[PDB]
Each structure stands twice: as C-alpha cells, then as structure tokens.
Amino acid sequence: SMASFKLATDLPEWKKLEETYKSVGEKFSVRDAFAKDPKRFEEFSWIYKNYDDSKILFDFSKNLVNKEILDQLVTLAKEAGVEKLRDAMFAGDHINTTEDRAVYHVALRNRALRKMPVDGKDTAQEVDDVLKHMKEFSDSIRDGSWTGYTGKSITDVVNIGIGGSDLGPVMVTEALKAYSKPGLNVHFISNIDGTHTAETLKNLNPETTLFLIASKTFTTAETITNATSAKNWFLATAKDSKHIAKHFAALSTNEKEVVAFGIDAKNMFGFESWVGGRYSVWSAIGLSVAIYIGFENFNDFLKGAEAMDQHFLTTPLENNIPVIGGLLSVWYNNFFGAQTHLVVPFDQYLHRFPAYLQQLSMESNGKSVTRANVFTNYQTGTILFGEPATNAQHSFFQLVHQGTKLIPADFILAAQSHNPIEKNLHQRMLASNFFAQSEALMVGKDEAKVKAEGATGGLVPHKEFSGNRPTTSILAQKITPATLGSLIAYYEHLTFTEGAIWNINSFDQWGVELGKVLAKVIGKELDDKKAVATHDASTNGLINQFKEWEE
Amino acid sequence: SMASFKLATDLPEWKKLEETYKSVGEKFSVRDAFAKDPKRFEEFSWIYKNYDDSKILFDFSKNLVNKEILDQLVTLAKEAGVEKLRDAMFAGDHINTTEDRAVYHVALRNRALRKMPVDGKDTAQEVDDVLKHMKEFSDSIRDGSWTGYTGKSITDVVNIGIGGSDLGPVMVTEALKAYSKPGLNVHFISNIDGTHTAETLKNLNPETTLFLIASKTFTTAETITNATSAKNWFLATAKDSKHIAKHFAALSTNEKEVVAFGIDAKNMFGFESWVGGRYSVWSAIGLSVAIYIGFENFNDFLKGAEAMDQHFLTTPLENNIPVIGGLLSVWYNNFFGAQTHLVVPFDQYLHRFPAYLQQLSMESNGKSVTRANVFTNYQTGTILFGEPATNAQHSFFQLVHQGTKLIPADFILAAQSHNPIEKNLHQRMLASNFFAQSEALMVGKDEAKVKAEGATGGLVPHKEFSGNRPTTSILAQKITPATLGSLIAYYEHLTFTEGAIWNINSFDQWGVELGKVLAKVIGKELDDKKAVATHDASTNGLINQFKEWEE
Ligand SMILES: O=C(O)[C@@H](O)[C@H](O)[C@H](O)COP(=O)(O)O
Ligand SMILES: COC(=O)c1cnc[nH]1
Ligand SMILES: COC(=O)c1cnc[nH]1
Ligand SMILES: [Cl-]
Ligand SMILES: [Cl-]
C-alpha cells in the first residue's frame, strides 16, 4: 500500500483526542477561554497576505479550541502524514489511487511557471499554452472581432455543462460580476430538465449568442443532449450547418466528437485527466469567466489560488491556515459528532459560494473507504450548506442560535463593497451584522439577563441563548478576483486536510456510477409503451404511475 | 399549563420506540421488507387528490419503516396530542403561547369561506376582502390601467423585503414562471448588502417600475433602509414626491408605520399578527405572485393549500400524509440520530423550493424549550438542505451514496413538463434519473457484484454501495399553482407534526427576533472613527481590523 496507515482510529492521537473531548471539549466555555487568555484573539487568528499584498484575516478564536486541543490536532495531522500526501500532490504523484491519476489542479494556476511534472514531464508550458489560447479567444469575443454568422458582435455566451463544468463558472461569474462589461452577458444551462434550455434561450438572439459546450469526453449524456437541443434552436434560425462554427466552442479533449458536432477543432480548449471536475474552474472550464470579466481578471484569480497554494505548501502546520480549518472540521465531525458545516457569506455576489463549496467538500469527502482499501468505521465528510447573510439571519439562524444541534459556521465579509451606495450606509449595516452575529453565538443570554429584559414566569427559558456556539470569521479587504482565488484554494486545501486525516481518496467519485447505469435502463423503459415489472415494487409503482400520467 | 405533557421522551411510547429501534429499526433492511410484504408499495404509498381532481402520489415505501414501526409512531402522535393541537390551530386558539397569538395561515387560503374565527370573530370576509383588493390591483397592473407617473404600463415589479417577506415570493414566482406574461417581470431586493440594490436597479426604468415594500412590522432595519434607497433612486429621476403614490405600495400589518414612510393607506395590503413570516406567502405578501402570474393562478395556489389543509384536518393519523412525513422525520432525527433532511426537486422551476423549506422547517422547529417551559433532553428540528436535480446529483450525491451519514431524502417530480421540448426527450431523461436515484439508494451494490463487474483486489470496496438508504418519492401530474400550494402545505403540516411531538412552539422565533436588535450597538461604533474595546477580544479585533481596512 502507498498509504502509511490504514484507519484514522489506528493513530495514537485519536484516542487522546477522544479523552480530551471528554475532559475539556464537550463542556468547553469560549467565554471562559477569553477570560483566561487576554491574547486569545492574537493566538487564534492569522493574517494571510496575498501575492498582491492584499490581506485576509482568518479568526478561529470563537471556536471550541485552545492551545492544548489545537496542539493535539496538529499531532494527529503529523501522524496522518498530511504533509507527505500534500507534498506528493504537488510533486505530481498519482495520489488518486483508485483511478491511478495525478491530482494537479495546483498546476493549473502555476503562473510562475515552476517546474510541475506529471510522469516526469513538466506541465507548466502545456497549461500556459491553453491559458494563452483562452486569452486570445476571450479577447476576440469582448472586442467584437469574433462576429456571428450575420456579422454582429456577440452579446450572450451560454455555457452548457453539468457538475464541475457548470457550478464553478456560475459561482465565479456571479461573485465577480462587478468586473463585467455592460452588453456582454453569460448564461448557464446545466439541468437536463428541458425548462432549463427553454427558459435560458427564450429571449436570446441566435445571431449574437455563443455556446461553450463543457464536457471532457464530449459524450456526457445530459450535456450532449442539452448541446444538441441548443444547436437545434440555433439552426431553427440560422438554417445552415456551416454557421455552427461561429457560434459553438468546446471545453473538451474529444476532437473527433467536437468536429462531428460542427465545431472547428481550433475552438476546442483542453484540460487533462488530472483535473477533477470540482477542481476545474481554474482550467479551460473557466473560459466563460475570462469572457465575462476579461482574461487579466481571470489570471489574477488564478494568481490568488497560486499564492494560497504556496502558503499551504510552505507553512508549518501550526500556522497553516487551510490546515487549521481542516483540523477544526475533524474536531467537530469526529469528536463532537456535528454532521454539518455552515458557510455564510455576508456578501450578495457570493450567493452561490456555499453551493460551490458543497460540491467541492461533499463530492471529495463523502467516502467510506480508506487508501488502505478498508471501510471506515468513523465519520468522514460533513454536510456543507449555507445561504448569504443577512438573509440567513431571518431564517434558519433561529435554529443556529436556539436549536439542539451544533453547527460549526464560517462567516465571510469584505471590508470594502464594490457597491458602496448611500455613502457606505448599507455596507456599515452589513458589517455590523457580521460582527454582531458571531458575538451573539458566543456570548448567548442567560436567565438573569432575560429577566432583567422583562420576561417573567414560563416565558423566560424560551428567550435564553446558550452561547458557546462556534464560528470562524473570515474578513477580506475586498472580494477581488485575487481574493476569491485565495478563498476557494483555502477550501480546496481544508478539504485536502480533512481527507488526509480520514485517510480517504478525496479525488475520486465512484458514487455517481450506480444511478447513471440504472437511469439508462429506465430511460429505455420510458421510451417503450408497456408497464414495467423489472424492478422493486416501489420503482415499478412509480414508473407505472408516471406512465399513466405522462403526456 | 396549557400543555398536556412536558417532554417527548417521557411519552410512554417513546421508550417503546427506543426498544423497537434497537431490535428492528437500526438494522432495518428495506430489501427484506419488500420481499416479506408483496403489497409494500400499496401499503406505504398514498394518492392525494387535489380540489381540481389532480393527483399527487406520496410513496414512502423506500423508508426504514414497516407497519409495526408506523403504528408505534402513530401511537406516539396520539400521546403527544397532535390532533388536539391541530384542532386548536384551526379553531383560532392562541397556540403561539410565547407571543400570545393565533396561528392562522390556514385562514389565508379559506376560499370556501368556512367560519374561521380569531378572538371569536370570523376572519373569512376580512381575508377575502384583502384578496379582492389584491385581485383589483394586480389586474390593473396587468391590464395597464395602473400607469406610472409618465402614463406608461408597469414592466417591472420589485419586491423589497427579507426572510418571510422575500423567500416565498422568490420561490413561488420562480416555480410558477411558466404562467407569467411577456414584458412583465419581477425582482426581489432583500439583502442589506448594497450590491443587492445596485445590481437589481441597474437597468430598470423608474417610469415603469413598481415597488412593493413587504414587511409584517414595517420596522425591519434591512427593509426600511432598502426601501429608502429605492425611493432615493426613484426620486433621482421622478423628482416630485407626489409621484410616489403610483410607484410604491406596502404589504404589512402596521398601517401607522407605512403611512409614516410616505406610502398612501389606499396602497397598503394588510394582514394580521397571526400570519407568521415563514407562513405568509398566502397573504398580502404574495401580491408579487398575483401580479406576475395573475390573481386567478394565485387563487388556484391558495385552493391547493386549502385542499391539503382539509386532508390534514379530516384524515385519521395512519393515513394522513403530512403526519406520516412528520413521523418519519421524528424517527430519523430522534432514533437514528440523522441531523439532516434533504429535499431534491427533479424540477428546475423549483430550484428555490429547498431554500424556502429550510426557512419554514428550521425557523419553526429550531427550539430547545417545550410548551411546559422546560428544556428538552432530546433533539428537535433537523437541518434541511438541497438543490434541484439533476444539478444535485452532479454536486453532492456522491456523499449521499457512499458517505458515512444517514440523510433522509425527499425527491419530487412532475410527470408532465411545462416545457416538453424535443418531443419530451428531456423530460424522459429527467424522469429516468428520479426513479433511478431512489432505486440506487435502496438497492446498493454488494462486494460480489463489484467483483462480477470487473474490479479486483483493493479497488473493490471503493466501488461498493451500501444501499438501504431511505428516500420518499413525490410524483405529481404537473407542478401547477394548485399542486405547488398543496406541496407547500404538506411541508407546513409535516413541520406542525414534528413540533407537536417535540412539544415545542413551532410558531415563535426568539433567535430571529434577537438578530433584528443585535447589530445596532456595533453599527453606532462603525459610525464613529475610534477603535473599540467594548466587546470580547475577537469582536474587538475584527471590528478594529475592519476599521483599518474600510473606505
Ligand atoms: O421569519 C421571520 O419572522 C423573519 O424572517 C421575518 O419574516 C423578517 O425578519 C422580516 O420581518 P418583517 O416582515 O416584519 O419586516
Ligand atoms: C443527444 O441528444 C439528442 O439527440 C437531442 C435530440 N434533440 C435534442 N437533443
Ligand atoms: C432608512 O434608511 C436610510 O436612512 C437610508 C438613507 N439612504 C438610504 N437609506
Ligand atoms: Cl467518528
Ligand atoms: Cl418489515
């Protein structure tokens, strides 16, 4: 086995952390910790400096953690060989053991052109060549030199893809929308549900719309179905297949399929097998971002990830920010038994950031088998969810404050808004909520205070707050491309750390296969007339009721 | 002392369910259940008939449940007085004990004009009179009789509101978008973040834009600030405040505060204290819906809720669809220890259905104190999350299939699409996924089958699927206004059932109420130049770093 251990439960520090949980962690008072340690904020906060000298404060000090606990977690990370696995990742080793592949999204943002080899062959130029092609193409869309079949500049660009071929481009174009150009819009078709195509294309002009079909194989069923429907929409107006070439490009490897579809092979933008879908927005898959906000902005976004990569690679564990966040996740997941991880951006542009992180985290770390090819009998990936604040405060934060579940939470705010309207009034209000919510989760409100505030009798307990509910606060200066690049890479490397401790392979996804195969079988049965009796009674029942109700 | 018991855990059936969990529940085999009971699908599926003779199938047969378990859960619901509390709700009794209020969203959709009294006075005509006002005004926007200040038809309707005054309008306008009219669009400003105002208003015309200021209290900080900024934007162009009367209306319980803001009382659409925000889309708060899709569609939506209300009120517990769903939730939450509940619509229109439910569910049932005014010694509300499929399948279903967490899931499909493009090809593909994903989660794939399919040695465990992962499948004919009204009411009444069992108040929200009075202290500190030391060191550190980095 390439693995140095079999199960996380084999590592000696695991039982020590179980005993620390019992003695110190279960009943941990964050209030008391601040009272005990005047330097607590200093000790449990870190400033990250980005390549452009901008900064991001990572404040972990309201978590259920102290020096003793964090030191034990760092010892666990050493026993798990986090650093060895990380170094092997950056070395190009095939640490995706089940697919026998490198894991080399870090090579996508190698703008410094460090030597970064796979199979002993540097990748730096091959990556950089695709980025230069991306710059050329995106520049031609943005400056009007690429025209549609009637000689008009492009106004709308539609990405068609599923999974990692959609969610990154969506989230990042939403997040960086302040950097867009009036009159050049992006759209994202992903669902096979034909609503998604019908509603997206309804008001678009075939003469000025450009499609990017995002699929490595160019044989992905939902994506190629969507792509074919979009091609039919285009041709309903254009009425000649020769026009396809001015309106369709591919984010793909499969030149025979692309060319068959009517796309000029010159307009295929490739990426390698060592790019995982949920780690792919840094690749050719990011073309829609480069078109929307310009290549130089996209490049700055890459350089922010690169800087965080360098932090992760070169920092001792006890000061390594993505490591610390991963260690705290393990602490809550495996010792407190918290099943979820909340992420709340106090930022409307970042409204799809939690959904992006949900794929990154859950698709990576929802695994039950270790690198030693044995079943875990301990918890692995958490369920990650969230919505932006302040909206979230009005809604499920009720349960975060007064429910019976521990919900570790990360709050994210920019000190500066891209839209500082009304002399920054909205922004000072937004910021006050950021600070106040984490404060309230810590401090709570005891029975005496509820009484002082005027409640009596049976009403009193209903108005109490436990406090000692943990948050991590992440304050950026401004959510620029660079900042966003660093923030995603933070979560990539947090996700890495978690998976390394659990000894899982964070980079495969075998779990998609069964439902795909079973869908193909059923699809054939939905094409046929007859009632079905080939499945369990529920599946048969559902299919047969559908058949009675369908068009 | 209105309560009939103190703690769920001390209901006599609770310990009997713990024993059943140990003996039959924990190791329940759904596969064996089907093999034992040839009628399992029929026994654990129910057809709901709506008022319009349309139908929805609720199949619970892939859950970890049998007759023995469900009969115990029904006994538990009887011991908890679910029926007595529900009857009190429908009588207008003040079952919201902590706020001393009726809970009477059911009266909002009383289209039959049954006697439904609060404080011994029928509400039927008062509710109906507001619906007539809504019909009049929405008709006048749609037919062009309500013009803007330069005599033009309204093209854009902007709702401004947050939480319960936002998420319903968002979700239902998205869900029922097939029923909208070209050239009449809706928009939703909610976040205090100035991005939300700036981006929403960027390309709208004040001459053809109508604002609905949606606030139960009409004092919410975010909303009143947002509404003031919108008025500033309007007056920048319109100049004369007399024009406001054509461009601003209010949805509220507080006439004095509306008129104080400068809105004419003739343009207020009222509701009462007994409408909770997360149950409010049925009231005046739904005006954006009636404008977008027409009042008759909105009325059909109400009538769907009313039909599900009648089902809930009149059906013995063992066949009562919302109750069965709530009983399964308690089973998973309290006996299996599953902390989450996944809701996945196989429907892109329903993309905001999970987020809406997240509010309804978590804000209702995230409580730690019972109706007997003692703290619980057991779990209450679950964490509800989800995204539409097929996007969700390609995001996080890896973990649903192969992770270490039990995640009870509800899947929802319509048999007929509003957009059956390409002769229903998309729709058949979408449906195949709906059936296959629930099939896959149940059947799994054992070691022998993985080997038969070609894996050897250490690769084998990585490709296994446990199966016996539960789902509920909900199959509608078509997601019409009526179907959606029934679906929401289903989840309202499921939420009621959970809360009744847990003996919590599902209708207050003392955490969300705190939130709305938290930020003002810090807000005053951000207005002042100086550094602060008035909080814990973390809050101080974050505020002071912010002050160094702000505009
Ligand atoms: O669920 C709730 O009570 C909140 O989300 C409210 O709906 C939100 O705070 C808005 O309150 P109001 O409608 O009074 O402005
Ligand atoms: C591959 O999908 C198709 O064949 C298709 C046909 N019509 C729309 N899409
Ligand atoms: C009520 O909020 C305000 O005073 C405000 C001022 N400018 C925009 N909003
Ligand atoms: Cl564990
Ligand atoms: Cl059984």
Q: What is A343-389 written as a DSSP string? A: EEES-STTTTHHHHHHIIIIIHH---BBTTS-B-SS--PPEEE---T
**What residue type is assigned to position B296 of the chain?**
E
How buried is residue A385: exposed, middle or buried, by Cβ count under 10 Å (0-12/13-18/19+)?
A: buried
Say which DSSP state A333 is in.
I
End-to-end CA distance of chain B: 55
List CB contacts of B377: < 8 A, sequence separation 6 or more: B7, B9
Task: Give, to the nearest 10 degrees, the angle between helix A421-443 and helix B221-238.
Answer: 170
Q: Are residues A482 and A535 part of one domain?
A: no
Kindly report the nearest CA distance between residue B375 and chain A, in angstroms: 8
Cα-only R_g, chain B: 25
**What is the length of chain B?**
551
Beta-ladder partners of B344:
B411
SS3 assignment, position B212: strand
SS3 assignment, position A503: coil
Q: What is the spatial distance between Cα A185 and Cα A177, in angstroms, rounded to a whole number?
A: 10
SS3 assignment, position A268: strand
Ligand 2 pocket, residues with Cβ under 6 angstroms: A 224-225, 228-229, 232; B 422, 425
Residue with tokens 């390309």: B203
Q: What is the spatial distance between Cα B498 and Cα B376, in angstroms, rounded to a whole number?
A: 14
The enclosing H or E element of B213 equals strand B209-214
The number of domains in chain B is 3
CA nearest to B488, candidates B329, B303, B346: B303
Q: Residue B252 is part of a domain; what is its CATH number?
A: 3.40.50.10490
In a domain, B49, yes or no: yes
Query: What is the SS3 assignment for A105-123?
Result: HHHHHCCCCCCCEECCEEC
Task: Name the experimental technique.
Answer: X-ray
Q: Is B378 on the interface with A (CB under 8 A)?
A: yes
Q: Are residues B500 and B415 part of one domain?
A: yes
In which region does residue A454 sit, left (phi positive, over 0), alpha (psi from -120 to 50) or beta (all else)? left
Residue A194 φ then ψ, to 5°: -65, -15
Query: What is the SS3 assignment for B399-425?
Result: HHHHCCCCCCEEEEEECCCCCCHHHHH
In a domain, B459, yes or no: yes
Could you give the residue numbers annotated as active site of B?
363, 394, 516
Q: What is the spatial distance between Cα A332 and Cα A315, in angstroms, rounded to a whole number?
A: 24
Cis upstream peptide for B197 (omega within 30°): no
Whether the CB-CB separation of B79 and B13 falls below 8 Å is answered with yes
In a domain, A1, yes or no: no
List CB contacts of B282: < 8 A, sequence separation 6 or more: B105, B108, B109, B275, B302, B305
Whether the CB-CB separation of A513 and A502 falls below 8 Å is answered with no
Whether the CB-CB separation of B231 and B262 falls below 8 Å is answered with yes
What number of CA atoms fall less than 13 Å from residue B456's CA on the CB side? 0
Residue with tokens 């529920």: A538
What number of CA atoms fall less than 13 Å from residue A125's CA on the CB side? 2
Angle among Cα A536, A540, A543 to the nearest 5 degrees reads: 145
How buried is residue B80: exposed, middle or buried, by Cβ count under 10 Å (0-12/13-18/19+)?
A: buried
The enclosing H or E element of A484 equals helix A481-502
Whether the CB-CB separation of A465 and B511 falls below 8 Å is answered with yes
Q: Are residues A533 and A420 part of one domain?
A: no
CA nearest to B334, candidates A465, A469, A405, A467: A405
In a domain, A114, yes or no: no
Tokens for A416?
A: 């500066």
Q: What is the spatial distance between Cα B482 and Cα B176, in angstroms, rounded to a whole number?
A: 10
SS3 assignment, position B326: helix
Whether the CB-CB separation of A481 and A293 falls below 8 Å is answered with yes
Q: Are residues B323 and B278 part of one domain?
A: no
Q: Are residues B265 and B143 part of one domain?
A: yes
Q: What is the spatial distance between Cα B503 and Cα B296, in angstroms, rounded to a whole number?
A: 38
Q: Are residues B255 and B196 part of one domain?
A: yes
Q: What is the spatial distance between Cα B512 and Cα A397, in angstroms, rounded to a whole number?
A: 7
Q: What is the spatial distance between Cα A461 and Cα A451, in angstroms, rounded to a whole number?
A: 10
How buried is residue B217: exposed, middle or buried, by Cβ count under 10 Å (0-12/13-18/19+)?
A: middle
Q: Buried b vs exposed e over B139-173: b needs ≥16 C-beta within 10 Å?
A: bebbeeebebbeeebbbbbbbbbbbbbbbbbbbbb
Question: Is B465 close to A514, i.e. CB distance below 8 A?
Answer: yes
Q: Are residues B330 and B407 part of one domain?
A: yes
Q: CA dist A227 to A162, A187, A232, A458, Å? A: 11, 14, 9, 62
Q: What is the spatial distance between Cα A490 and Cα A340, in angstroms, rounded to a whole number?
A: 18
Q: What is the spatial distance between Cα B141 and Cα B135, in angstroms, rounded to a whole number?
A: 10
In a domain, A385, yes or no: yes
Binding residues of B for D-glucose 6-phosphate: 164-165, 215-220, 359, 363, 394, 516
Q: Are residues B274 and B403 part of one domain?
A: no
Q: Is A395 on the interface with B (CB under 8 A)?
A: yes
Pairing of strands A471-476, A55-59: antiparallel
Task: Give, to the nearest 10 degrees, the angle between helix B481-502 and helix B353-365.
Answer: 20
Q: Nearest ligand, CA of residue B32?
A: 5
Tokens for B329?
A: 């939730």
Q: What is the spatial distance between Cα A487 and Cα A62, in angstroms, rounded to a whole number?
A: 20
Tokens for A254?
A: 């499969």
In a domain, A300, yes or no: no
Q: Which residue, among B99, B341, B435, B483, would best test binding to A if mutated, counting the most A CBs under 10 Å from its CB?
A: B435
CA nearest to A211, candidates A184, A243, A249, A245: A249
The enclosing H or E element of A421 equals helix A421-443
Q: Are residues A495 and A393 part of one domain?
A: yes
Q: What is the spatial distance between Cα B292 and Cα B154, in angstroms, rounded to a whole number?
A: 11
Q: What is the spatial distance between Cα B468 and Cα B337, in angstroms, rounded to a whole number?
A: 16
Say which DSSP state B375 is in.
B
SS3 assignment, position A497: helix
Tokens for A42?
A: 């200093």
Q: CA dist A128 to A117, A270, A282, A369, B362, Å? A: 14, 12, 12, 36, 47
SS3 assignment, position A427: helix
Q: CA dist A350 to A4, A353, B129, Å? A: 39, 5, 41
Pairing of strands A156-160, A209-214: parallel
Q: Are residues A156 and A22 part of one domain?
A: no
Count of other CB atoms within 10 angstroms of residue B223? 26
> For residue A527, what are the domain limits?
513-549
How buried is residue A125: exposed, middle or buried, by Cβ count under 10 Å (0-12/13-18/19+)?
A: exposed
Whether the CB-CB separation of A498 and A79 falls below 8 Å is answered with no
How buried is residue A328: exposed, middle or buried, by Cβ count under 10 Å (0-12/13-18/19+)?
A: buried
The enclosing H or E element of B547 equals helix B537-549
Tokens for B139?
A: 């008709």
SS3 assignment, position A32: helix
Q: CA dist A161 to B55, B315, B396, Å? A: 34, 45, 16
Q: What is the spatial distance between Cα B107 and Cα B282, in angstroms, rounded to a whole number?
A: 9
Edge-to-edge strand order for the sheet containing A45-49? A45-49, A55-59, A471-476, A409-414, A340-345, A383-385
List CB contacts of A455: < 8 A, sequence separation 6 or more: A463
Q: What is the spatial distance between Cα A358 and Cα A342, in angstroms, rounded to a whole number?
A: 10
Pairing of strands B209-214, B156-160: parallel
How buried is residue A265: exposed, middle or buried, by Cβ count under 10 Å (0-12/13-18/19+)?
A: exposed
CA nearest to A440, candidates B512, B544, B217: B512
How buried is residue B531: exposed, middle or buried, by Cβ count under 10 Å (0-12/13-18/19+)?
A: exposed
Pairing of strands A117-118, A121-122: antiparallel
* DSSP per-residue codes, A211-259: EEEE-SSS--HHHHHHHHHHHHHHHHHH--GGGGGGTEEEESS-HHHHH
Q: What is the spatial distance between Cα B79 and Cα A440, in angstroms, rounded to a whole number?
A: 37
Q: Residue A540 is part of a domain; what is its CATH number?
A: 1.10.1390.10
Whether the CB-CB separation of B79 and B12 falls below 8 Å is answered with yes
Count of other CB atoms within 10 angstroms of residue B461? 18
Pairing of strands A45-49, A55-59: antiparallel
Q: Is A410 on the interface with B (CB under 8 A)?
A: no
Whether the CB-CB separation of B123 and B110 falls below 8 Å is answered with yes
In a domain, A524, yes or no: yes
SS3 assignment, position B343: strand
Q: CA dist A236 to A224, B283, B427, Å? A: 18, 44, 21
Q: What is the spatial distance between Cα B72 and Cα B12, in angstroms, rounded to a whole number?
A: 11
CA nearest to B291, candidates B104, B159, B105, B151: B159
Whether the CB-CB separation of A490 and A321 falls below 8 Å is answered with yes
Q: Are residues A280 and A362 part of one domain?
A: no
Chain B residue nearest residue A338, CA to CA: B339
The enclosing H or E element of A210 equals strand A209-214
Tokens for B502?
A: 């847990």
Q: Is A510 on the interface with B (CB under 8 A)?
A: yes
Say which DSSP state A81 is in.
T
Q: CA dist B192 to A421, A430, B162, B518, B523, Å? A: 11, 6, 9, 15, 13
Q: What is the spatial distance between Cα B517 and Cα B459, in angstroms, rounded to a whole number?
A: 56
Q: What is the spatial distance between Cα B127 and Cα B283, in angstroms, rounded to a whole number?
A: 8
Nearest-by-Cβ selection for B376 from A166, A388, A404: A404
Binding residues of B: 164-165, 215-220, 359, 363, 394, 516
Whether the CB-CB separation of A430 and A390 falls below 8 Å is answered with yes
Q: What is the spatial distance between Cα A89 and Cα A96, in angstroms, rounded to a whole number?
A: 9
* DSSP per-residue codes, B276-299: -GGG-TTSGGGHHHHHHH-HHHHH
Distance between Cα B222 and ligand 3 center (Å): 10
Domain boundary among B296, B323, B340: B296
Whether the CB-CB separation of B376 and B511 falls below 8 Å is answered with no
In a domain, A21, yes or no: yes
PDB resolution in Å: 1.5
Whether the CB-CB separation of A477 and A416 falls below 8 Å is answered with yes
**What residue type is assigned to position A166 of the chain?**
D
Q: What is the spatial distance between Cα B260 and Cα B474, in angstroms, rounded to a whole number?
A: 47
Of the listed A174, A207, A272, A363, which one is catalytic? A363
End-to-end CA distance of chain A: 55
Residue nearest to atom 3 of ligand 3 (CA): B225
* DSSP per-residue codes, B485-529: HHHHHHHHHHHHHHHHHHTB-TT--HHHHHHTTTHHHHHHHHHSS
In which region does residue A265 sit, left (phi positive, over 0), alpha (psi from -120 to 50) or beta (all else)? alpha
Residue with tokens 């069965």: B324
Q: Nearest ligand, CA of residue B33?
A: 5
Cα-only R_g, chain A: 25
Q: What is the spatial distance between Cα B214 and Cα B129, in angstroms, rounded to a whole number?
A: 19
Beta-ladder partners of B412:
B345, B474
Q: Nearest ligand, CA of residue B63?
A: 5
Tokens for A293?
A: 């906000």
* Peptide-bond breaks in chain B following residues (C–N over 2.5 A): none
Q: Are residues A287 and A179 part of one domain?
A: yes
Whether the CB-CB separation of B401 and A488 falls below 8 Å is answered with no
Whether the CB-CB separation of A344 and A393 falls below 8 Å is answered with no
Which ranges constitute the DSSP H helices of A52-189? 67-79, 82-90, 124-142, 167-175
Whether the CB-CB separation of A209 and A157 falls below 8 Å is answered with yes
Q: What is the spatial distance between Cα B329 and Cα A175, in angstroms, rounded to a whole number?
A: 36
Sign for the pseudo-dihedral over CA of B331, B334, B338, B339? positive
Edge-to-edge strand order for the sheet containing B55-59? B45-49, B55-59, B471-476, B409-414, B340-345, B383-385
Enumerate long-range contacts of A432-435, CB under 8 Å, 24 or more apart. Answer: A432/B519, A432/B520, A432/B522, A432/B523, A432/B526, A433/A346, A433/A389, A433/A390, A433/A393, A433/B192, A433/B515, A433/B518, A433/B519, A434/A346, A434/A389, A434/A473, A434/B542, A435/B519, A435/B522, A435/B539, A435/B542, A435/B543, A435/B546
